[PDB]
Design a protein around this nucleic acid. Structure first.
Lengths: 53, 320
RNA sequence: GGAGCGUGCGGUUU
RNA sequence: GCGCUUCGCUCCCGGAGCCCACACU
RNA sequence: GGGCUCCGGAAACCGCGGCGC
């Protein structure tokens, strides 16, 4: 998967930055998922943190 | 970037001063969380990997839902916008099916060719195509837009009419261009009224928010996760109907002309329509038996045959 | 129970 | 060998339930 | 007679047939 985004200014591209607005690019095709979902509670705690839950 | 659904209509007024009693109704805004789900669709961002249904599969289990369905079947490897409609709202998917769809692609040519030729050729498609896969029905390509070309990789966006297969569109270009090409990576950017905006959410976010709701009792997040079925018809031409009529169409009444309060421009014979309350909730879906103007000038006969109704009965008092 | 979106059929058993 | 071969939807048919409804004088 | 809502194999594991690694 080569396509990348720079979601803030919302532009796809295969490059590492969107010079037009200087935001680095993340990979387009969003993190895989298994119903297992280990890291489940482990991530949950990281989120609860940035919200204050 | 213009598809067939981004042309703005006018709000045509029939009953210049009409009103609705709050006492019997639930506007999309403030429905109780537990029923917002009964009547929601999640704008899902499908990960690669799972088939499209096998996603819905997990959405069910993990949210202890019974009955939920999805929009345009997005294949295993495609990522992107996959409206998944829940509980009683399941069939709104009907609405979605024959709407626009935008993709970001990444065709990969099986041989070199002059940058501009690629551009020249792909722009050749903007219009109608007759489908030619490897060794009969026509399909529209509303627009192609080439983002970047690196070597034989061609990253583009493209908008298409329901049930174009992008793989083919590419294979076709492939032959058009001479060298032959294969589609390397794909992603759906929008299905119709479901865009890649702030409402599009990833499995993970969905689950984590849902757990914030059960373990933690925070409603907020897991609500902003689900979209109210109304957004599943946003693209359809709507007709707002006065209160008394609501109760009726519910029970299986075809909506007759003097129910209409507000109307949309440019409706025709046999077009899908969204029957709405003045509270802007989805009542039902139908085929118009009467054009836009026809409905506004008249008071005799029926506007829309009703064919599927979402609105529940007790929601509006009977009275007719 | 059929037709189709979508390749289907025969055995222990809600 | 391992994975998938369908969440579900639509048309018809059978069964259960609700109506017959131009949305007031 | 028509309209609407709900249901109509909702069951795991097993043999080909059918696509994919």
């Amino acid at each position: 998967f080569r396509i990348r985004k720079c979601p803030k200014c919302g532009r796809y591209t295969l490059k590492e930055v969107c010079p037009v607005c200087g935001e680095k690019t993340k990979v387009a095709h969003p993190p895989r998922f298994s119903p297992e979902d280990p890291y489940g509670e482990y991530r949950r705690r990281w989120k609860r943190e940035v919200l204050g839950i | 970037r213009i598809l067939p659904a981004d042309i703005k209509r006018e709000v045509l007024i029939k009953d210049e001063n009409a009103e609705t009693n709050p006492d019997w109704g639930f506007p999309p805004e403030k429905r109780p969380i537990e029923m917002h789900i009964q009547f929601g669709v999640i704008n899902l961002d499908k990960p690669p990997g799972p088939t499209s249904h096998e996603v819905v599969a997990w959405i069910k289990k993990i949210l202890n839902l019974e009955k939920a369905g999805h929009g345009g079947t997005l294949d295993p490897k495609v990522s992107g916008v996959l409206p998944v409609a829940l509980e009683k709202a399941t069939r709104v998917v009907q609405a979605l099916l024959p709407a626009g769809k935008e993709y970001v692609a990444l065709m990969h040519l099986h041989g070199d060719v002059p940058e501009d030729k690629i551009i020249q050729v792909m722009k050749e498609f903007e219009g109608e195509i007759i489908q030619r896969p490897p060794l009969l029905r026509t399909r529209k390509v509303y627009y192609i837009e080439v983002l970047e070309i690196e070597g034989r990789d061609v990253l583009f966006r493209v908008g298409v009419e329901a049930g174009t297969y992008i793989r083919s569109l590419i294979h076709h270009i492939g032959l058009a261009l001479g060298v032959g090409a294969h589609m390397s990576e794909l992603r759906r950017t929008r299905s119709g009224p479901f865009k890649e905006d702030e409402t599009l959410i990833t499995l993970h976010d969905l689950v984590d928010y849902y757990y914030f709701w059960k373990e933690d009792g925070i409603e907020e997040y897991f609500r902003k996760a689900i979209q109210p079925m109304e957004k599943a018809v946003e693209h359809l031409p709507k007709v707002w109907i006065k209160d008394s009529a609501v109760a009726a169409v519910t029970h299986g009444a075809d909506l007759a002309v003097p129910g209409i309060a507000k109307l949309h421009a440019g409706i025709k014979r046999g077009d899908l329509v969204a029957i709405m309350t003045l509270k802007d909730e989805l009542v039902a879906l139908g085929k118009a038996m009467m054009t836009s103007q026809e409905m506004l000038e008249k008071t005799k006969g029926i506007a829309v045959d009703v064919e599927k109704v979402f609105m529940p009965r007790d929601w509006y008092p009977k009275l007719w």
